[PDB]
Amino acid sequence: MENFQKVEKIGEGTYGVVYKARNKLTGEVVALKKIRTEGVPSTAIREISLLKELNHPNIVKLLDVIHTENKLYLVFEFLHQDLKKFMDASALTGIPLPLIKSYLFQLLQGLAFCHSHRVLHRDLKPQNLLINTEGAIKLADFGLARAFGVPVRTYTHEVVTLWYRAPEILLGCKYYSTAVDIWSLGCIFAEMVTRRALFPGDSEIDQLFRIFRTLGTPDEVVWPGVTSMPDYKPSFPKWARQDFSKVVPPLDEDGRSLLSQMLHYDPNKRISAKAALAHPFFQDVTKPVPHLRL
Numbered sequence: 001m002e003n004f005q006k007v008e009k010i011g012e013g014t015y016g017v018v019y020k021a022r023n024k025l026t027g028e029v030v031a032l033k034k035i036r037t038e039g040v041p042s043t044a045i046r047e048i049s050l051l052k053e054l055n056h057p058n059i060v061k062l063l064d065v066i067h068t069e070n071k072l073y074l075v076f077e078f079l080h081q082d083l084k085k086f087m088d089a090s091a092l093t094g095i096p097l098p099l100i101k102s103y104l105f106q107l108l109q110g111l112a113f114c115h116s117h118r119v120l121h122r123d124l125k126p127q128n129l130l131i132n133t134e135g136a137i138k139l140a141d142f143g144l145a146r147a148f149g150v151p152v153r154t155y156t157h158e159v160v161t162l163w164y165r166a167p168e169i170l171l172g173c174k175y176y177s178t179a180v181d182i183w184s185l186g187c188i189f190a191e192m193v194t195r196r197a198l199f200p201g202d203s204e205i206d207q208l209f210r211i212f213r214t215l216g217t218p219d220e221v222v223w224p225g226v227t228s229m230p231d232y233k234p235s236f237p238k239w240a241r242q243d244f245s246k247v248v249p250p251l252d253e254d255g256r257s258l259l260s261q262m263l264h265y266d267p268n269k270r271i272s273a274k275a276a277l278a279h280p281f282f283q284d285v286t287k288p289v290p291h292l293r294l
């Protein structure tokens with residue numbers, strides 16, 4: 001290439017291929033994401049460029065945005081593993097509660113920062129949470145979804161994961177709020193605890209109905225305005241709500257309480273990242289060292 005020497009292909013994200021690369025000059029190791037298609041919005045590059053200013057210990061640093069050859073390259077600080085792989089690796093024994101709590105606490109700090117700066121993630125999922133050997137966890141891809149509006153798919157035949165999508169997005173809301181990220185994080189929290197995806201839908205309607213089957217079909221009482229949402233249908237089946245005690249066993253009441261607040265149907269009732277940080281669940285939070293095999 002130029003100043004980068006490709007080390008390996010880390011995968012193919014929701015936008016393009018990703019390579020672990022080394023700056024032939026500085027020797028720094030980074031993750032290089034090649035963005036897919038022939039023009040590239042000048043509006044996007046401006047907004048993206050703004051994200052370079054988004055510095056927080058729990059947010060993967062966006063080192064550079066390179067628009068050349070009329071194609072886009074994003075250079076990110078590199079982390080060795082993502083939470084999806086770590087969760088799979090910890091499946092037999094489960095991630096210890098102190099580490100689950102540490103990660104959740106750090107992720108909420110990251111979200112509180114992004115949200116206070118009017119930046120939404122919009123597509124939080126285990127694969128987008130990166131971890132290192134020091135016990136840190138960081139949010140990857142903040143603000144990229146907005147600088148591109150609607151996601152749809154990756155770029156070339158790849159099944160988009162809907163498991164962490166907030167119900168307002170599924171019901172067609174056109175304006176996302178910071179609440180969508182809290183919902184996704186609540187789903188991730190539940191998954192670390194039970195070692196199974198909370199709402200593993202395989203279609204937009206299956207996703208919505210899995211949510212309804214567990215939290216109850218929403219109505220005007222718990223979610224004012226829900227029946228007027230774009231894709232709401234009076235024909236939706238009416239399921240009764242289940243008990244959290246059965247949803248995320250054996251999580252304690254502090255944890256169930258916080259999760260319930262992160263999973264409220266009304267985006268406006270859903271707890272903020274800042275408020276969640278003050279929840280009693282974090283009274284004894286610590287920063288454990290994970291057993292990471294690289």
Ligand SMILES: NC(=O)c1cc([N+](=O)[O-])c(Cl)cc1NCc1ccc(Cl)nc1
Pocket residue numbers: 010011012013018020030031032033060076077078079080081082130140
């Ligand atoms: N910032 C990053 O470091 C990073 C970025 C992206 N991405 O989307 O631009 C992706 Cl996919 C993975 C990453 N690393 C985690 C990782 C995963 C697997 C291996 Cl072998 N090595 C590292």
